[PDB]
Amino acid sequence: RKPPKGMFLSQEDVEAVSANATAATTVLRQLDMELVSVKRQIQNIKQTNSALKEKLDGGIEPYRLPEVIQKCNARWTTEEQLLAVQAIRKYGRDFQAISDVIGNKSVVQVKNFFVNYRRRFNIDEVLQEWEAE
Amino acid sequence: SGVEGAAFQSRLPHDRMTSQEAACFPDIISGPQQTQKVFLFIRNRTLQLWLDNPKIQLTFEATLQQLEAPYNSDTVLVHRVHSYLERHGLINFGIYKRIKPLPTKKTGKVIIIGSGVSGLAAARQLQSFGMDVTLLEARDRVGGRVATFRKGNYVADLGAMVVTGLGGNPMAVVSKQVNMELAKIKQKCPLYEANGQAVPKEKDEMVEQEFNRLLEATSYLSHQLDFNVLNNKPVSLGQALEVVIQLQEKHVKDEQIEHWKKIVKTQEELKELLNKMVNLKEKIKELHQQYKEASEVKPPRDITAEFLVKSKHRDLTALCKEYDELAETQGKLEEKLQELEANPPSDVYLSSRDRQILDWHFANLEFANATPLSTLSLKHWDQDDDFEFTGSHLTVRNGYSCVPVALAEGLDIKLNTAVRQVRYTASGCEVIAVNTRSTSQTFIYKCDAVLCTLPLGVLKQQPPAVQFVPPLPEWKTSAVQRMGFGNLNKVVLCFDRVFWDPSVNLFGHVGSTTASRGELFLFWNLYKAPILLALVAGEAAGIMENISDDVIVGRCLAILKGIFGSSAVPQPKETVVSRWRADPWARGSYSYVAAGSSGNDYDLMAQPITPGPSIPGAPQPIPRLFFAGEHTIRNYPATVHGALLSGLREAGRIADQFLGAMYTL
Ligand SMILES: Cc1cc2nc3c(=O)[nH]c(=O)nc-3n(C[C@H](O)[C@H](O)[C@H](O)COP(=O)(O)OP(=O)(O)OC[C@H]3O[C@@H](n4cnc5c(N)ncnc54)[C@H](O)[C@@H]3O)c2cc1C
Numbered sequence: 146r147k148p149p150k151g152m153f154l155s156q157e158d159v160e161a162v163s164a165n166a167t168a169a170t171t172v173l174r175q176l177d178m179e180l181v182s183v184k185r186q187i188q189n190i191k192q193t194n195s196a197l198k199e200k201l202d203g204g205i206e207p208y209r210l211p212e213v214i215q216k217c218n219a220r221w222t223t224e225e226q227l228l229a230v231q232a233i234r235k236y237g238r239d240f241q242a243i244s245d246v247i248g249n250k251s252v253v254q255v256k257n258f259f260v261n262y263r264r265r266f267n268i269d270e271v272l273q274e275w276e277a278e
Numbered sequence: 279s280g281v282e283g284a285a286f287q288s289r290l291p292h293d294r295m296t297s298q299e300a301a302c303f304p305d306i307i308s309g310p311q312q313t314q315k316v317f318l319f320i321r322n323r324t325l326q327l328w329l330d331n332p333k334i335q336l337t338f339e340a341t342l343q344q345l346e347a348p349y350n351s352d353t354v355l356v357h358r359v360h361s362y363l364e365r366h367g368l369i370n371f372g373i374y375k376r377i378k379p380l381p382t383k384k385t386g387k388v389i390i391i392g393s394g395v396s397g398l399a400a401a402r403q404l405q406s407f408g409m410d411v412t413l414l415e416a417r418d419r420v421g422g423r424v425a426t427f428r429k430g431n432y433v434a435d436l437g438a439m440v441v442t443g444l445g446g447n448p449m450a451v452v453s454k455q456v457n458m459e460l461a462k463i464k465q466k467c468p469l470y471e472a473n474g475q476a477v478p479k480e481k482d483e484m485v486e487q488e489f490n491r492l493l494e495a496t497s498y499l500s501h502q503l504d505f506n507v508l509n510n511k512p513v514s515l516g517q518a519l520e521v522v523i524q525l526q527e528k529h530v531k532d533e534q535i536e537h538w539k540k541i542v543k544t545q546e547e548l549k550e551l552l553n554k555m556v557n558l559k560e561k562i563k564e565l566h567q568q569y570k571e572a573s574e575v576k577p578p579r580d581i582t583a584e585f586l587v588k589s590k591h592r593d594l595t596a597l598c599k600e601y602d603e604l605a606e607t608q609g610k611l612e613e614k615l616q617e618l619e620a621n622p623p624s625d626v627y628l629s630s631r632d633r634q635i636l637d638w639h640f641a642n643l644e645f646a647n648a649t650p651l652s653t654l655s656l657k658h659w660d661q662d663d664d665f666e667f668t669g670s671h672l673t674v675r676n677g678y679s680c681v682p683v684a685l686a687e688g689l690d691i692k693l694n695t696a697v698r699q700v701r702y703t704a705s706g707c708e709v710i711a712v713n714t715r716s717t718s719q720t721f722i723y724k725c726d727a728v729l730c731t732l733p734l735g736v737l738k739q740q741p742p743a744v745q746f747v748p749p750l751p752e753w754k755t756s757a758v759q760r761m762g763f764g765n766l767n768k769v770v771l772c773f774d775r776v777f778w779d780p781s782v783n784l785f786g787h788v789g790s791t792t793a794s795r796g797e798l799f800l801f802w803n804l805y806k807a808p809i810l811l812a813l814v815a816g817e818a819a820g821i822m823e824n825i826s827d828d829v830i831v832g833r834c835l836a837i838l839k840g841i842f843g844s845s846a847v848p849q850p851k852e853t854v855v856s857r858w859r860a861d862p863w864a865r866g867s868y869s870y871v872a873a874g875s876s877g878n879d880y881d882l883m884a885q886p887i888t889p890g891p892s893i894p895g896a897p898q899p900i901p902r903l904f905f906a907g908e909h910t911i912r913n914y915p916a917t918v919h920g921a922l923l924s925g926l927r928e929a930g931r932i933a934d935q936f937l938g939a940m941y942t943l
Contacts, residue, residue: 146502152495153529154522156503162524163508169524176531183538190545197552201559205601208566210591227581228588235589245592246585 218249221258225250229258230266237275281319284326288368289446289665292322302362302942319349320359328369332451335376336360336369361941365933367403367926371448373455373684376406384410386936389709389723391697391744392731394422395918396906398685399925400729400932405689407933412723413689414711416696416863420686423733423864423908424918426679427770427854433677434770434809436856438918445668449681449919456684459675461804469638469786474840477635477788485632489639495522496656506657512873515659516652519640523627530627541618548611555604558597565594638788641795645815648867648916649764655873662877665913673804678918695721700728701747704892704899726936727902729928731921734883734909735763735865743862746903750887757882761909762872765819765859769798769812769834772852776808777842787837794818798834810838823857830855868916869909880912884924886931900935904928 148154162169221229225247232243240252247255259268285292295314299321300307306317323345328336338360342350350356363369370376386409390397393415401411425437441460444450453460469477477485496518499505505521506513569590575583628636644650647659674680692711699710707728713719736743737758749755778785784802789795796816803810812834814822822830831853838847858867871877886901906924914920 148498148502149491149494152491152498152522153525154495154499154503158525158528159499159503159505159521162521162528169520173524173528173531176528176535180531180535180538183535183542187538187542187545190542190549194545194548194552197549197556200556201552204605205559205562205598208562208594209598210569210594224581224584228585231582231585232589242592242596245595246588248588 213248215249217251217254219254221250226262226266229255229262230268230271233259233268233271234275237272281322281326284329285322287329287446287450288325290321290325290368293318298366299362302939303358316349316352317355317359320345320356321363323349324360324363324369328363329451332372332454333374335374335378337377358941365407365939365941366930367399367923370406371399371403371926372452373402373687380405381408384408386410386727387725388412388727388729388932389414389707389725390729390731391700391709392416392422392733392907393420393682393686393691393693394731394733394907394921395424395682395685396908396910396921396925397422397729397731398682398689399922400731400906400929401689401925402685403926403929404932407929407937409933409936411690412725413691414695414697414709414723415691415693416714418693418714420691420693421679421682423858423868424678424682425856426677428677428679429772429852431807432770432772432809432852433675433807434768434772434805434811434854435674435678436768436770436854438678439673439804441672441674442917442919443667443669443671447667447919448922452681452922456681458678458680460672461675463671463673463804464781464783465671466782467784467786467800468782469635469788470841471631471634471788472790472840481632481635485635486639488628489636492519492522492636500656513656514652514873515654515656516650518656519651527627530624533623534625537618537623541615544611544614544618548608548615551604551608551611555601555608558601558604562594562597562601565590565597569594633792634788634790637792637795638786638799641789641799641815642786644796644817645766645800645813647764647870648766648815648819649762649870649872650817653762653764653870653872655871655875658871658876661871662913662915667919675804675806681918692721697732697744699745699747700730700903702728702887702889702902704889704896707902727904727932729904729906729932731906731925733763733864733866733907734758734761734869735859736863738763739865748889754882754885754887757879760872760875761879761883762870762875763866763868763909764870765867767814767819767822767856767858767867769814769830769856770852770854771810771812771831771834771850773808773810773848773850775848777846777848778803778810785841787841797822798837801838812837820859822855823860827853827855870916877912880910880915883907884910884912884927904932 162172165171228247229243232246236242236246240255243255244250244252250258262268282292290296295303295307295318299317303317306313324336324341327341327344338357341360342353342356345356360369388404388409388411390401390404390411390413393401393413397413397415398420401413404411421437423437425435427434427436440463441447441449441453444453452458469482471477496515499518499522500513505518508517569587572583572586572590640651647654694714695711696714697709697711701708701710707725709723709725709728711721711723713721730737732744750758778801780803783804784800786800787798789797789799796814796818798812798814799818800813800815801810802813831850835847835849858864869880884905886905887903888901889899889903891897891899906921906928908916908918908921908924911920911924911927914923
């Protein structure tokens with residue numbers, strides 16, 4: 146019902162190696178050429194990616210900033226409010242980035258902050274005008 | 279075991295009745311199952327008695343004595359069973375001291391063309407049925423294709439050599455009646471490449487297992503894909519193997535293509551990662567500058583200038599985070615390419631060294647079938663493996679000629695008598711033969727019936743070596759053209775000293791080329807004396823016949839030298855090279871199931887010919903021309919046992935015709 150295991154005998158393949166006298170060596174030569182074509186295309190992208198590797202040698206070690214570890218504080222200094230209004234105008238609703246900018250407020254605090262100072266800081270307008278970017 | 283082993287050892291099913299028995303006993307088969315089992319017993323029990331001592335005739339009286347009740351109640355049932363068995367050579371066949379000596383006066387006259395084993399087997403049976411039999415033999419000896427070389431102590435069969443197992447083999451019976459020195463055969467066959475050095479066990483098991491694998495593949499190809507016709511021509515075995523190999527070479531290449539295709543897929547995936555990482559590093563390098571400039575505006579500053587430092591700092595750690603997640607991902611792809619480039623699939627299907635070793639297993643198969651694999655029928659070439667005997671294979675150390683010579687005893691044989699024409703008519707037959715030594719002494723033999731055991735090679739000969747008058751009908755001559763008559767030859771090498779491994783019976787030599795795989799590809803150490811036999815198979819056989827003995831023995835010496843060392847190989851004292859296709863009384867070696875033929879042809883060959891009426895409108899005549907030989911038995915062609923069985927078969931049929939069958943009632 147099935148060929149011995151390892152042997153590959155599909156009704157499709159047989160009638161393709163029997164279509165003519167040389168239809169066998171024809172089929173087997175396209176594959177040989179096809180394998181050679183893939184091998185070169187392999188070494189082509191192997192050298193393309195060897196060049197790209199060289200371009201980013203050194204990674205980004207020189208451009209990293211040390212880590213500021215700060216304790217999420219509760220009170221909004223007048224300074225920290227002002228950082229917020231500008232963070233909103235540059236980031237909109239990305240609270241995680243906005244906290245990252247302030248450095249001592251949590252996303253929850255930032256989330257609350259829009260609701261609390263929404264009228265006093267025209268946060269609707271700010272967002273509204275951030276949307277034009 | 280017991281009575282049921284008697285049925286097995288007689289190629290009979292112990293619990294069922296055969297088509298032949300249904301013919302002779304239609305009363306019993308159409309009747310109640312109890313009587314069937316009684317019959318089936320009486321058959322098996324009589325067979326057992328004959329088998330337990332086949333050096334003495336088994337008379338009906340002796341038979342009825344030995345079987346008990348309820349089975350010895352129906353004396354005619356017992357008499358019928360015995361007579362059926364005796365007639366068709368299932369009992370009292372071969373060389374048996376008989377109790378009841380021959381009828382003083384005989385009945386009917388039979389001419390048997392050929393004193394090869396099929397011939398002798400019939401002749402002994404007919405003579406033991408009270409008929410007058412004469413065998414016409416072209417050669418100066420009996421045995422036909424059972425030939426045996428003898429000179430001094432040196433003994434080696436140029437013809438048949440091997441009993442293929444005693445399980446269910448009639449030659450087992452003959453082996454008790456004739457002392458044949460039956461030696462077992464150790465099948466360990468170590469190979470040796472052209473260089474002269476053993477193939478290592480790793481390859482030997484590998485290549486062999488691929489060989490057997492390639493065979494089952496053709497079977498699958500024939501049975502499940504019905505790949506048996508191609509360009510309005512029957513597919514051979516050779517064609518089918520080429521297809522299977524090509525498709526295994528194709529799959530190796532398909533496999534490689536997909537493996538490399540997986541690699542370039544990830545390399546392209548990598549490519550787009552680096553592009554994304556160069557372009558990100560460039561942005562990071564810019565932002566850092568922007569930040570360090572904004573950070574260098576010394577304080578105290580206003581809150582926008584402070585926002586600039588902070589935001590640029592966020593923006594930079596944000597891109598620095600991306601670039602780290604991309605570097606982690608880059609390492610993942612980087613190791614994959616190491617994994618794949620380190621797990622490549624098979625480079626090739628079979629190397630040239632491997633293919634040459636495979637070519638030897640093919641030569642061995644070409645040798646067993648005595649023909650190039652391009653001539654064997656794909657569908658039917660193995661149609662007789664179902665009836666293979668059980669047990670080890672054996673040689674005859676004292677020479678296999680001992681058996682026909684034994685059968686020829688007490689028979690009227692005309693040696694050096696070549697039949698030239700066979701004439702059969704509604705009133706009898708005349709066979710016309712000449713003397714081989716002087717071709718003008720002409721002989722005329724008149725007879726009731728002719729048994730033709732002419733080799734299929736001879737019946738195939740164009741122009742005819744034997745004319746049939748009237749000609750054979752085309753249903754028979756077309757069977758003769760369709761069937762295959764193949765060829766294989768032996769070189770007998772006779773030394774004064776044993777320089778080979780005495781515990782290896784047989785060892786191979788791997789050929790240079792596909793085309794020459796059969797040239798001396800195997801060697802036999804089967805005999806007491808220092809004899810090594812080299813064999814020629816496949817396409818090589820027909821070509822080695824146009825090369826002198828000295829050149830042929832030359833090549834054997836060279837091959838042997840490479841194996842055992844240029845100094846351990848003496849010259850041979852006695853050399854003999856067979857040339858069986860050249861032999862005019864054989865014109866080949868034995869039959870094969872050619873592409874376009876089938877096992878039905880072997881039955882066609884066995885049909886007797888019945889001449890037309892001489893007087894027009896006179897009643898339909900009796901058959902006059904009968905045939906036997908290895909090419910006439912569908913389940914056991916190309917063997918000695920098969921020839922012998924066919925001789926027994928005709929002797930029963932001829933006797934039924936002329937002596938009459940009284941056991942059918
Ligand atoms: C090399 C070789 C090895 C073999 N090895 C084995 C083996 O190991 N085991 C095995 O079982 N089988 C083997 N066989 C096959 C076996 O030998 C044959 O199947 C069997 O011997 C044939 O017997 P036969 O009676 O059919 O024909 P033959 O033995 O050929 O009898 C034919 C007879 O007809 C004669 N004859 C031919 N033309 C004429 C004519 N015009 N007039 C008169 N007489 C004529 C011949 O001379 C011969 O006497 C082998 C065959 C060969 C060739």
